[PDB]
Amino acid sequence: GSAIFAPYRTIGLISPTGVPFTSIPLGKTTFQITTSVGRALQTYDLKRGLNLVFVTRPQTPSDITATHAWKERVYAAFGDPRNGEPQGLWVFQRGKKVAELPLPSDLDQPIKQILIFGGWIVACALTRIEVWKAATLEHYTTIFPAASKKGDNELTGGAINMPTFLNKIFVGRKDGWVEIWNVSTGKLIYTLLPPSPDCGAVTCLQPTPALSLLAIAYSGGPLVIQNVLTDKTVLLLEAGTDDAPVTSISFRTDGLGAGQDGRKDGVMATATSVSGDVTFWDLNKGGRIMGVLRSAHNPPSRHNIVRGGISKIEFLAGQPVIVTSGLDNSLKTWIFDESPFSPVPRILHQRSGHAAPVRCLHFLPSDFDGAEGGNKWLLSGGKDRSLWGWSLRRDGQSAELSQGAIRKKARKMGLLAGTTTLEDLKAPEITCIASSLNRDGGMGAIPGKQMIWDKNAELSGNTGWESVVTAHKDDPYARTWFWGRRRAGRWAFKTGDGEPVSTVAISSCGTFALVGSTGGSIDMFNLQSGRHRQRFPSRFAPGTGRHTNAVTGIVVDPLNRHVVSCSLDGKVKFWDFITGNLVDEIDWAPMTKIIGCRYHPGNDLIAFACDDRSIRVVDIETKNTIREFWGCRGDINDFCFSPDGRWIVAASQDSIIRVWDLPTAHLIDAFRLEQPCTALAFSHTGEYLAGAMEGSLGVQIWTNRTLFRHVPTRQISESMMTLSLVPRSRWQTLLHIDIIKARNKPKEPPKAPEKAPFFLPPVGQNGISSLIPQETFTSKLLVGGAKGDYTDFIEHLKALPPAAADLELRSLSIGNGDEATNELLHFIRALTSRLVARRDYELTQAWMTVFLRLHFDLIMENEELLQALGEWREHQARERDRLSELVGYCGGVVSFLRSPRT
Amino acid sequence: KPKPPAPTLTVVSDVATVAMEDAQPATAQGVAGGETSMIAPQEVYAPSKDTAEKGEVVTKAGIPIAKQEMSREEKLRRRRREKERIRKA
Amino acid sequence: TVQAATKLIEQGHVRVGVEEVRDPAFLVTRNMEDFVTWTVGSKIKQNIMKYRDKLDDF
Amino acid sequence: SVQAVQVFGKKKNATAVARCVQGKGLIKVNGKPLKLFAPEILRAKLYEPILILGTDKFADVDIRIRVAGGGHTSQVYAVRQAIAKSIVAYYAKYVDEHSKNLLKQELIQFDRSLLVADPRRCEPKK
Amino acid sequence: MKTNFKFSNLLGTVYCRGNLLFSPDGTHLFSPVGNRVTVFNLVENKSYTFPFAHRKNISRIGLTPQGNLLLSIDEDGQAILTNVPRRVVLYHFSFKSPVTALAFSPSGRHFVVGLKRKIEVWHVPSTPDTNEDGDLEFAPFVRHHTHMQHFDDVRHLEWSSDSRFFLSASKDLTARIWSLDTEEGFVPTVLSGHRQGVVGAYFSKDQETIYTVSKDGAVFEWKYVAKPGHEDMQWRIVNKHFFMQNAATLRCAAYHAESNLLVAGFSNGIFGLYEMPDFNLIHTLSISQNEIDFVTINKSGEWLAFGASKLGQLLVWEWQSESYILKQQGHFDAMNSLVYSPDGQRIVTAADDGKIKVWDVESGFCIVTFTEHTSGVTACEFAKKGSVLFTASLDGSVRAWDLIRYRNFRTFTAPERLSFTCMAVDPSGEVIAAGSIDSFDIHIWSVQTGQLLDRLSGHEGPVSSLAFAPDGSVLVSGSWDRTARIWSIFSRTQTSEPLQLQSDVLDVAFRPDSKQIAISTLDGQLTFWSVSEAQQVSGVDGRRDVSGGRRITDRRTAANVAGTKNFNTIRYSMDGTCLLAGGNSKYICLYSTTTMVLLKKFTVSVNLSLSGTQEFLNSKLMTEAGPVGLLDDQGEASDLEDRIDRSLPGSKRGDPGARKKFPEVRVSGVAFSPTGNSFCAASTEGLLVYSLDNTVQFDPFDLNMEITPASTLAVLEKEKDYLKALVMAFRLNEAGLITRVYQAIPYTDIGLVVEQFPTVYVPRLLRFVAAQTEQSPHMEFCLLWIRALIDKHGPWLAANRGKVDVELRVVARAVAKMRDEIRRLADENVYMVDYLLNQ
């Protein structure tokens, strides 16, 4: 585990796994679609769009592998113990764990599906079925299917229950057999055989809206629907290819949708995991087909990197809405219109994410002090060739940046049916991005529709031009992106050399975009008009400073004076901006080959990542290296700063994150990741860290334990007159407490009644103020004077409140008249002792002032304390001569130096 | 156009500026701040002819000068200065 | 007309002094009648300048 | 549709209409070209704004100027003011605001009378 | 200077819509201000503001009774909880409905919230400050129970003392007794019998007798006695009585149970407090003319806190001594202008309410109010001497106050009656220039004669901004005839050089080194002129750089809207390189004066309740009948004093009606500090004081490779080379390390290290020792340091005088703190002791 970052949330991830979602109808108006993240569950609402409602906590230690949703709780079974991992079944409610289930001891199989009905719940794991009494959450018994063949005993498909069938589950086996089991007595009551026995395995099965008609979809291809107590086939459809077996079927239970008029019912949707297209059958006459929604999600292929496939289809109850969840990180819902006869539906909701692991991350800079801050908008460029703006605050306002009407363009082309794919039709994969919202005009960035990447200025200057610049993989252009519109910009800059872009940067002014190819040229473009302004070098020797190799990491100072550039091999060059000429080159040629750079404004610091597996931080002002870090064992994958400038974070290829404290030049954090991290980004306020892993699609967010609680970690690893602390205001109001109470009296007095209540009730800590410290003050002073240390007394007088201090100073007295009893003499001796020790000078002065101000009569009458006053006068005279000479000299010299000209 | 000005008088007391302030626990003024009596010495006392003794007169500088101790030439010059003032008005 | 004036100052074309006025109920006194003018970059000001052919595009 | 910017220049009683359109680079005054229109010693005061801003800025514009009123020096000052204000307003309206700011910076660093006509009021030592 | 300005504290407003709180110690007062929450520390005079920022105004504030967690809920149920000892935001959350009541259990594990009809009790979330191995979960709040058994607004919720029962006081004339879990002899019972709805329902100490306090001015004591026919008992009403405040309904009541006393705050502003169980009137008085919004008693019971909404009007009253503890008054109108005192310790605002007031920078309290003005007060300004303050107001009088006797020793008025809207003063404190709208002259009085010196003229329009030059030789006016005028007065020839601009002038300001002037015009651009050769040396058109808008009631896009695209007020920084500009918009810009680029932009208020604080509104907020924040919603009010609409039609500047729904945001005044390091801006949200961030940011000066904190302490302790260690510490610029080193070196080699110190690091050292004088308790040490520095580098500072003026000023203010705080005391003590010894 780590000593700084605790995992907060895997954001950017709505449906990545092969396990299906499940829906539940709340009320008469809303549906909860609950799907699986991989370590928790997400429940979305349907009436409120598809906003998130609950994320489950705590994270289950294994991958989640079966979900269901009963009345309000959600049951989640996790863990495939055939390889190492632990397993269990948990009961969440509102996103918090409220129960666990007792698993059998001898269960060494992953849990495929869960089914709740009656009073029972039923888990079909792999070759055995566990059952639980749900009213008490206890085990009941275990159903063991038997077979003559080891393969044929395996339980593929699953177990579904019919609606009206009491205590009877329907299991499907690996052979074409479907067995009906009474779960209460654990007794096999029937088995039914597949027609035309060339068909092999029951792939899925679903009860129809008709009473006691079950729909069994075989891996040999046929869809059958059968009376499950007559064992007579009602319909038989050659509805599956031998290589494409149907995996999910669902019936529209509304009451219309077929008959080529929309007036008749009987519509069945079906979906095959190897396709991305769903099929709709109208079942009136003989079970004809009526449509195919082509490419409901990404079509799974074995060669491409973009994942695909359809996990589940469920017609929502009594409604034309059909919700489909892809393997490609997407959840869409479609709807059939009524008044035009729509055979295939249209889309009305879509949540989506990246369909491939994330390649680069960038927190958007802070809306200067706005509500967004620097920790709201994350910009993730993903290997499915997409660019998303995730939002850490609400998961429903995360939007894909549009690259033009790409889906309309594909569908007017033929990329949906059967040539290239949609990922190929989008832009190339993003390598690096650099942004600034100094001119992001928000929703009305450029009013009207604008052309996209073309390869008028008053309106642009009035509202605002582009805000994100993006360097892709191997394209000779670097693209621009509007941010306020979440759409692609109107400019795509060449590099000048024709070589592909290598690194792009943008001014803090939001005006200039600097592209740097892998050839060496660094071109500069004004973004508002999209025009070439400056080239580095323009046309030391003026005009000869061009880089010899790839250019990685240019970054422009916020003052628009210098641009600093880092070559791939060799040098780091500071260029003067407006003339466009080289100014100072520092050469690390023979020993390294610099792989990246990051910048810290407000500190003016640069960090170069060097491919001898080291990190060098250099100051841009003095132009010499200031810190070096030697920690890595592989190539530095990604590194960044903290906005405090106290940490520099690096994640290498060794699947280890290191965090270096910069001022003390040490390590602080070094923690191992389960998969090697690909990209890192720290937020522009210090809360969130964002890591895009390798293999995992969607990014991870860590918090900042240090920003919340102080951590003790500093372990480098490898694997004279003085004043007091008393409040100035306290001793000053002790000095002035007559007039402060005089003004704090009200102007008119309160109208206390004639029948004034005598003996107001006791308030405060036992009759006095609650601010006097709880445990006699004259006893304290006198016992100290019997002793020699008044320090207990002086500390007590320090910790007194002001009114009580004036009271316990007025309540001193002469007493009996003996030398060891008179509080005044002992008080003067205490002040004298403090003055000799030189401890609380201002306090002794204030106490002496109030003391002489309200006790001068006794001290002018007596002499036994006038001796102590003489000693006090001597000490006070010496100390005041020294300090007054000091203070007056300093004040006079300072006044003369401020105004010497008169 | 705001108003024609009208004479408004406001009486001030001898209470300190720490009685002029608003209600707060401890004053923002220091220890020197708190002895300034909100009226000047010019107003707490000013030597003038309406507050001199019987025989003596007070001069322009604020120094009491006795009519007995003045010589004749001093009396003559002071009468001339009074006559010059009265002619000026 | 008065209807045309109300439509204009609801669109926010008319300042008085230095501040624009969007409320059509502002009561102009006899010292502000000399200062009620158009706003700075107004399309109305541009159209007046284009009528008098003195449109200074700087 | 076509980009055009009209601007006015002023002197004592010399006024200067300058209409700037995207063109090949030519500059005309009352039809006659710029190298011709002046008395032969004020042509440098005419070329001052072009020579400050460089010819690449005027490479894309075509300036047609009319002038009337005032004497010779007045007309020359009106034309140079119209030239400077024309190119600054055209760069304000049709290319980037940063380029407009840099141009106005160079012109003001030379002489403010290139942009804002300062008339000679009567206010002698009262 | 370093342009790293984070958000330090709010100031200038003390209480707004919301509910007060006391810390369980009994010292700290938590008061809502707009959409931030201000802590007033009272046992020592201090104040700060939590770093969170709500979106709408604060509605309720609760506090975990241990003291560490605060939870603030705005309107529309957005809630933020934070940790108070380490002032950091912790969790955000959304109660879906507007929160109307909130109370934390004294056991600390629970808190109840009363939504409109609902009542939900939740578990208090575990915090990282509390657990040892724990960090932020995703969903921290765990809902424990819901209750919808009410019928109207739930207005109060109060726990018991054992934290097992709580009471809910509704608006349908009912209190209700609820429990946490199912008890054995309990039913969730109702208490009815009232006339105008319950305001509060409190328990006794021994939880057998409870009290309900109702808006008609009534209070009823309930006990558990049997039915009057005798297992069969019932919560019935043992006795009743009435406050007899005649024409008024009580808004807010509170009950300290340990002392058995009840305080009630009414609508005619006269609160009263009563020893409860026998109902003896302890006393009563009128705090305010308007109304009393919320009362809250101290945990101990000796202090009361009252908050009045319509004005600032916060006050803590100490009832057994019959005296205030504080009575602060936040402005009830728009702050027109402000200036700092030249010491820098206290600032002064002039508001369009009529009252000017001097606030202290620390402790956030207004320390004096001047109210001799009979209408709104426009610009106020100090002299260089920092003891005389000149104010100019709309009542036609330029007044001149003294700050050591608090009496306006001069009042100036032009013979023909004008309404002064801008003014300025010669820095010697001898000449006051002023100008108006109604007359295009510009008046000049002298302060030592009291009569009008002259009427300068030459302006074909009303003068709108004035500025004296800090060297005290030039006046500069700027007027709506599109002109600026360099007035030269003090010479024998009064001359006036004109500067022609393009548009109206809105602000003028001088560089501190007086050779440069900056004027902000109506186009929205800043032009920087040189005062010797009156030629423009720079210019920035920042219309796009400041445009943030779309107020409600505006049918232009925020891009096209005119009137919010200029700079109302500009000021130079105390270094001379950073101009600060603020206009009628959401953004405050901070430019540099040499490179002329936008160094930094700030947003003044993320508060959505003000008008123009987001530049794109939404169709959700637009209904069919215009914007939903425009329907006159006064009619559904219960109080006639709130139902009456005494507004005047077409009154942009302040009217006593002041409907004031969704006020505009405008940065009406800005000013730097003479101590550097901070500035502030008077906005309609209040008075935002921004400061630098030097403790949260590592920012080295010129670092080497071989300088660590470990190496610095090593060359301090091991080899003992004090100069080298100190230079390394200042090179690292880590304040803890610098304090460690500078306290570690002894007081006899001080002359050595100061003689061998580098001149480049001199001024930062002077700033550091001045701050150490003002904060540290090592005063003789710090004064020894300053004396050594000035005696060694004497002629260097005197030769420079421009690069080190702010450093010398902060050294002077620290030394004056020391002198006028302690040495006057020592002198008075020794003279008194001499006389008492000499009899």
CSV table of C-alpha atoms in Angstrom, one decimal, chain A residues 340-521:
chain,number,residue,atom,x,y,z
A,340,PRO,CA,-44.6,5.9,-37.8
A,341,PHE,CA,-44.1,2.2,-38.0
A,342,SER,CA,-40.5,1.9,-36.9
A,343,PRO,CA,-39.3,-1.7,-37.4
A,344,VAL,CA,-35.8,-1.0,-36.1
A,345,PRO,CA,-35.6,1.6,-33.2
A,346,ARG,CA,-33.9,4.9,-32.7
A,347,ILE,CA,-31.5,5.8,-29.9
A,348,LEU,CA,-32.6,7.9,-27.0
A,349,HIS,CA,-29.9,7.4,-24.3
A,350,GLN,CA,-26.3,6.6,-24.4
A,351,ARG,CA,-23.6,6.6,-21.8
A,352,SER,CA,-20.2,5.6,-23.2
A,353,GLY,CA,-16.6,5.4,-22.3
A,354,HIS,CA,-13.3,4.6,-23.9
A,355,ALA,CA,-13.4,1.3,-25.8
A,356,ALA,CA,-9.6,0.9,-25.4
A,357,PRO,CA,-7.1,1.6,-22.6
A,358,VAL,CA,-6.3,5.3,-22.0
A,359,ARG,CA,-3.1,6.8,-23.5
A,360,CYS,CA,-2.7,10.3,-22.0
A,361,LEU,CA,-4.3,12.4,-19.3
A,362,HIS,CA,-4.4,16.1,-18.7
A,363,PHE,CA,-6.3,18.0,-16.0
A,364,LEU,CA,-7.8,21.2,-17.6
A,365,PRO,CA,-6.3,24.3,-16.1
A,366,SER,CA,-8.2,26.2,-13.4
A,367,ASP,CA,-11.2,28.3,-14.3
A,368,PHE,CA,-9.2,31.2,-12.7
A,369,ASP,CA,-10.9,30.9,-9.4
A,370,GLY,CA,-14.3,29.6,-10.5
A,371,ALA,CA,-16.4,26.8,-9.3
A,372,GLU,CA,-14.7,24.4,-11.7
A,373,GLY,CA,-11.3,25.0,-10.3
A,374,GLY,CA,-8.5,22.7,-11.5
A,375,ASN,CA,-10.1,19.5,-10.2
A,376,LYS,CA,-13.2,19.2,-12.3
A,377,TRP,CA,-12.4,18.5,-15.9
A,378,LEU,CA,-10.1,15.7,-17.0
A,379,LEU,CA,-9.1,15.2,-20.6
A,380,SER,CA,-8.3,11.7,-21.6
A,381,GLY,CA,-6.9,10.7,-25.0
A,382,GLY,CA,-7.6,7.1,-25.7
A,383,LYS,CA,-6.2,4.3,-27.9
A,384,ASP,CA,-9.6,3.8,-29.4
A,385,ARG,CA,-8.7,7.1,-31.1
A,386,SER,CA,-11.1,9.2,-29.0
A,387,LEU,CA,-10.9,12.2,-26.8
A,388,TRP,CA,-13.1,12.4,-23.8
A,389,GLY,CA,-13.7,15.1,-21.2
A,390,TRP,CA,-14.4,13.2,-18.1
A,391,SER,CA,-15.8,15.1,-15.1
A,392,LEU,CA,-14.8,14.1,-11.6
A,393,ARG,CA,-17.8,15.8,-10.0
A,394,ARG,CA,-20.8,14.3,-11.7
A,395,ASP,CA,-20.4,11.3,-13.8
A,396,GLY,CA,-23.3,12.3,-16.1
A,397,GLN,CA,-21.7,15.4,-17.5
A,398,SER,CA,-18.7,13.6,-19.0
A,399,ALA,CA,-18.8,14.1,-22.8
A,400,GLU,CA,-17.0,12.8,-25.8
A,401,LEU,CA,-15.5,15.6,-27.8
A,402,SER,CA,-17.2,15.4,-31.2
A,403,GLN,CA,-15.0,15.1,-34.3
A,404,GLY,CA,-17.8,15.9,-36.7
A,405,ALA,CA,-20.8,13.8,-37.6
A,406,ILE,CA,-18.8,10.7,-37.4
A,407,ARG,CA,-21.6,8.2,-36.9
A,408,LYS,CA,-23.8,9.8,-39.6
A,409,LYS,CA,-20.7,9.7,-41.9
A,410,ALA,CA,-20.2,6.0,-41.2
A,411,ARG,CA,-23.9,5.2,-41.8
A,412,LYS,CA,-23.9,7.2,-45.1
A,413,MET,CA,-20.9,5.1,-45.7
A,414,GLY,CA,-21.0,1.5,-44.9
A,415,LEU,CA,-18.8,1.0,-41.9
A,416,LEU,CA,-21.7,-0.1,-39.8
A,417,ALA,CA,-22.9,-3.0,-42.0
A,418,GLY,CA,-19.8,-4.7,-43.3
A,419,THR,CA,-13.4,-1.2,-46.1
A,420,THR,CA,-12.3,0.0,-42.7
A,421,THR,CA,-13.8,0.5,-39.2
A,422,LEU,CA,-15.2,3.4,-37.2
A,423,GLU,CA,-12.0,3.8,-35.2
A,424,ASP,CA,-10.2,4.0,-38.5
A,425,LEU,CA,-12.6,6.7,-39.6
A,426,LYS,CA,-11.9,8.8,-36.5
A,427,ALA,CA,-8.7,10.8,-36.0
A,428,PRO,CA,-5.4,9.0,-35.2
A,429,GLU,CA,-4.6,8.0,-31.6
A,430,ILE,CA,-3.7,10.8,-29.3
A,431,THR,CA,-0.1,11.0,-27.9
A,432,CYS,CA,0.0,14.4,-26.1
A,433,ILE,CA,-2.4,17.3,-25.4
A,434,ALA,CA,-1.8,20.8,-24.1
A,435,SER,CA,-4.6,23.2,-23.2
A,436,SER,CA,-5.4,26.6,-21.8
A,437,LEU,CA,-8.9,28.1,-21.1
A,438,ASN,CA,-7.6,31.7,-21.2
A,439,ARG,CA,-9.9,32.1,-24.2
A,440,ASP,CA,-12.4,29.2,-24.1
A,441,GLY,CA,-15.5,31.1,-24.8
A,442,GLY,CA,-17.8,28.5,-23.4
A,443,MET,CA,-21.0,27.5,-25.2
A,444,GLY,CA,-21.0,30.3,-27.8
A,445,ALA,CA,-17.3,29.9,-28.8
A,446,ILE,CA,-17.9,30.6,-32.5
A,447,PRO,CA,-21.6,31.1,-33.3
A,448,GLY,CA,-22.6,28.9,-36.1
A,449,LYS,CA,-21.3,25.7,-37.5
A,450,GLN,CA,-17.6,25.6,-38.3
A,451,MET,CA,-15.5,23.5,-40.6
A,452,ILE,CA,-13.3,20.9,-39.1
A,453,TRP,CA,-9.5,20.8,-39.5
A,454,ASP,CA,-9.3,22.8,-42.7
A,455,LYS,CA,-5.5,22.2,-43.2
A,456,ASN,CA,-13.2,36.2,-40.0
A,457,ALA,CA,-11.7,37.6,-36.9
A,458,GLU,CA,-13.8,40.3,-35.1
A,459,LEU,CA,-16.4,37.7,-34.0
A,460,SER,CA,-13.5,35.4,-32.9
A,461,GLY,CA,-11.9,38.1,-30.8
A,462,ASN,CA,-15.3,39.0,-29.3
A,463,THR,CA,-16.2,35.4,-28.2
A,464,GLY,CA,-13.1,33.1,-28.1
A,465,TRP,CA,-11.0,30.8,-30.2
A,466,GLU,CA,-9.6,27.3,-29.7
A,467,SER,CA,-8.4,26.0,-26.4
A,468,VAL,CA,-6.9,22.4,-26.7
A,469,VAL,CA,-4.1,21.5,-29.0
A,470,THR,CA,-3.4,17.8,-29.6
A,471,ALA,CA,-0.4,15.9,-31.1
A,472,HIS,CA,-1.4,12.6,-32.5
A,473,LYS,CA,0.6,9.4,-33.2
A,474,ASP,CA,2.1,9.6,-36.7
A,475,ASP,CA,0.1,12.2,-38.4
A,476,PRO,CA,1.9,15.1,-40.1
A,477,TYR,CA,-0.8,17.4,-38.6
A,478,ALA,CA,-1.5,18.5,-35.0
A,479,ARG,CA,-5.1,19.2,-34.4
A,480,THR,CA,-7.0,21.9,-32.5
A,481,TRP,CA,-10.1,21.4,-30.3
A,482,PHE,CA,-12.6,23.8,-29.0
A,483,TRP,CA,-13.3,23.2,-25.4
A,484,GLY,CA,-16.4,25.3,-24.7
A,485,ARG,CA,-18.3,23.4,-27.4
A,486,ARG,CA,-16.7,20.0,-26.9
A,487,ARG,CA,-16.1,19.8,-30.6
A,488,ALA,CA,-13.1,19.7,-32.9
A,489,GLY,CA,-11.4,22.9,-33.8
A,490,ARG,CA,-11.2,24.5,-37.3
A,491,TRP,CA,-7.4,24.3,-37.5
A,492,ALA,CA,-4.9,21.5,-38.1
A,493,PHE,CA,-1.3,22.6,-38.2
A,494,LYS,CA,1.4,21.1,-40.3
A,495,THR,CA,4.9,20.9,-38.8
A,496,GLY,CA,6.9,22.4,-41.7
A,497,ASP,CA,9.3,19.6,-42.1
A,498,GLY,CA,6.6,17.1,-43.1
A,499,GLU,CA,7.7,14.8,-40.4
A,500,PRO,CA,5.1,13.7,-37.8
A,501,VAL,CA,4.4,15.9,-34.8
A,502,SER,CA,6.3,14.9,-31.7
A,503,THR,CA,5.2,17.3,-29.0
A,504,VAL,CA,2.8,20.2,-28.9
A,505,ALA,CA,2.4,23.0,-26.4
A,506,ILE,CA,0.3,26.1,-26.1
A,507,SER,CA,0.9,29.5,-24.6
A,508,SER,CA,-0.6,30.4,-21.3
A,509,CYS,CA,-2.0,33.4,-23.1
A,510,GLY,CA,-4.3,31.1,-25.1
A,511,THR,CA,-3.0,32.6,-28.4
A,512,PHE,CA,0.0,30.7,-29.7
A,513,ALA,CA,0.2,27.0,-30.4
A,514,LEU,CA,3.7,25.6,-30.9
A,515,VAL,CA,4.2,22.3,-32.7
A,516,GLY,CA,7.4,20.4,-32.8
A,517,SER,CA,8.0,17.6,-35.2
A,518,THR,CA,10.1,14.5,-34.8
A,519,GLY,CA,12.4,16.0,-37.4
A,520,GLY,CA,13.5,19.1,-35.5
A,521,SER,CA,11.5,22.1,-36.7
